[PDB]
């Protein structure tokens, strides 16, 4: 269906321990394909997916130069941020940035993104119109003023509508065997008595891609949202993901519970129960 390309920058200051660390990663959907770490012995944009390896020296050199330049830029931004928040130079701080594009099945731009955070909180974000900004506080309003004067949003829009989409489509074509393949979950229900009158039912989903999935427990056909323990979707390490949902049920009432699984790789939503 639809796809996304996303770049994530993290800039971490560390006074007394050198210049701020700059780490960048690139994702197509839930698949990482590039990385950069300024702390590496030889900092370069490096491949993390097999389908990006075919790109030539011009690509990798260009990307490496962008990452070094960006590292410089955000090292400056950390100092600027120190000034905007009246903070000392002795403390450690973090700037985060995520930007990129969503395209639909037809490969046309669904929407663009360019949002940043300072110390884990919203700072400034490019609005969906790709022409205006949302600033989270008065510090970010200064940046907003600066960027409105410099028409930065137009450059960002030019990137998000152009190169971002085109290169995303390129990646989607080169990595079609994986990027355009959904792996459905392998599902099953486990049963563990916790006492003579209560038992845990746990609905497992394993080995699915992409990460987006819905697991819900129903009792007598009714959603048990507020009584269901849901763990965070986790990476298995082989590109696929895992998740489970658990509910505590009265002994003898297990069959009144059904687990419902929704995933892109499934032709239709799945229903399963404990099979003693």
């Amino acid at each position: 269906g639809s796809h996304s390309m996303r770049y994530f920058y993290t800039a971490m200051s560390r006074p007394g321990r050198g210049e701020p660390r700059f780490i960048a990663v690139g994702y197509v959907d839930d698949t990482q394909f590039v990385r950069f770490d300024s702390d590496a012995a030889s900092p370069r944009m490096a491949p993390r997916a097999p389908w990006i390896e075919q790109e030539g020296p011009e690509y990798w050199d260009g990307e490496t130069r962008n990452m070094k330049a960006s590292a410089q830029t955000y090292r400056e931004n950390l100092r600027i941020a120190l000034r905007y928040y009246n903070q000392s130079e002795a403390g450690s701080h973090i700037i985060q940035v995520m930007y990129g594009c969503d395209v639909g099945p037809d490969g046309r731009l669904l929407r663009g993104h360019d949002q940043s955070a300072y110390d884990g909180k919203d700072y400034i974000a490019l609005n969906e119109d790709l022409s205006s900004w949302t600033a989270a506080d008065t510090a970010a309003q200064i940046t907003q003023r600066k960027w409105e004067a410099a028409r930065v949003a137009e450059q960002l829009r030019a990137y998000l509508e152009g190169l971002c989409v085109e290169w995303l489509r390129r990646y989607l074509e080169n990595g079609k065997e994986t990027l355009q393949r959904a792996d459905p979950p392998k599902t099953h229900v486990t049963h563990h008595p916790i006492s003579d009158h209560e038992a845990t039912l746990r609905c497992w989903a394993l080995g699915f891609y992409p990460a987006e999935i819905t697991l819900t427990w129903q009792r007598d056909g009714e959603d048990q949202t507020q009584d269901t323990e849901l763990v965070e979707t986790r990476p298995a390490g082989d590109r696929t993901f895992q998740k489970w949902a658990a509910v505590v049920v009265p002994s003898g009432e297990e069959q009144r519970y059904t687990c419902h699984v929704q995933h892109e790789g499934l032709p239709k939503p799945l229903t399963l129960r404990w099979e003693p």
Partner: peptide, 10 residues
Amino acid sequence: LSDSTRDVTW
């Protein structure tokens, strides 16, 4: 491909 169009500061 990352955006190069960056030297824009806060």
